[PDB]
């Protein structure tokens, strides 16, 4: 958990209104992407995250950056709203999941191996610390709402991960 880059490291602004507590442990984990450029340099990812918080607060009218966590192609996990806060990333699932978004656009390409592995470590970390249910269901954004997110190629990768839940075939 110390490997997680905190909000203060990307100069986050404090939420406009009191955030909503998320009832833990979460039953679902949604994987998304930002549909932005990707970068292997921490300085660039930090720029993207801070500009995204503004996009979400000022361009979208939301309370804070939408995701609970972000994964950069530099292999880092960045704190979004965190482990205990209801996100604004997946309509119909915000109150019962953690939203993890990969920084980039993965319609054809895949995030770096390190980014993919750190994301898996983040999931194990959450289960191990009790934030994520032991029998949690891992799902993708596109399975919940009409959207390319987290990108076709990344979606194909995720469905090969343990805990992947096929909402349609069930």
Residue choice 32, 100, 118, 158 for contact with ligand MLD (CB under 6 A): 32
How many angstroms separate the CA atoms of 92 and 114, rounded?
30
CB 58, min distance to ligand MLD, A: 12
Closest C-alpha among 111, 2, 4, 104 to residue 48: 104
46 touching ligand MLD, by CB under 6 A: no
User: Is 70 annotated as a binding-site member?
Assistant: no
User: Is 76 annotated as a binding-site member?
Assistant: no
Residue choice 31, 98, 105, 139 for contact with ligand MLD (CB under 6 A): 105
- What are the tokens at 95? 């109150």
12 touching ligand MLD, by CB under 6 A: no
In eight-state DSSP terms, residue 18 is P
Q: Are 80 and 66 in contact (CB under 8 A)?
A: yes
Adjacent-strand bridge partners of 26 = 132
User: Is 141 annotated as a binding-site member?
Assistant: yes
**CB half-sphere exposure, 149, CA atoms < 13 A:** 21
Site for ligand MLD in 150-169 (CB under 6 A): none
Would you report the helix, strand and coil content of the chain in percent, each value rounded to 5? 30, 20, 50
Q: Which is nearer to ligand MLD, 107 or 127 (CB)?
A: 107
40 touching ligand MLD, by CB under 6 A: no
Closest C-alpha among 104, 106, 134, 132 to residue 38: 104
Span of 39-47, 71-79, 117-125, 146-154 interacting with ligand MLD by CB under 6 A = 146-154
User: Is 145 annotated as a binding-site member?
Assistant: yes
- DSSP characters over 103-123: SS--SSS---HHHHHHHHHHH
Q: Which is nearer to ligand MLD, 3 or 73 (CB)?
A: 73
* Binding site, annotated residues for peptidoglycan: 33, 56-67, 81, 88-94, 141-149
Q: Which residues bind ligand MLD (CB under 6 A)?
A: 32-36, 52, 55, 62-64, 66, 88-91, 94, 101, 105, 145-149
């Amino acid at each position: 958990l110390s490997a997680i880059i905190p909000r203060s490291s990307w100069l986050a602004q404090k939420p406009m209104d009191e955030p909503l507590p998320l009832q833990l442990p979460v039953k679902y984990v949604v994987i998304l992407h930002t549909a932005t450029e990707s970068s292997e340099k921490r300085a660039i990812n930090v720029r993207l995250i801070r500009d995204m918080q503004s996009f979400h607060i000022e361009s979208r009218g939301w309370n804070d950056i939408a995701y609970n966590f972000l994964v950069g192609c530099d292999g880092n996990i960045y704190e979004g709203r965190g482990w205990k806060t209801v996100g604004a990333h997946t309509l119909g699932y915000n109150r019962i999941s953690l939203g993890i978004s990969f920084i980039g656009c993965f319609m054809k390409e895949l995030p770096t191996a390190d980014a993919l592995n750190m994301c898996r470590n983040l999931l194990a970390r959450g289960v191990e610390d009790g934030h994520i249910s032991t029998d949690y269901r891992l799902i993708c954004h596109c399975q919940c709402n009409s959207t390319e997110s987290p990108g076709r190629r990344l979606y194909e990768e995720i469905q090969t991960w343990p805990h992947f839940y096929n909402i349609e075939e069930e």
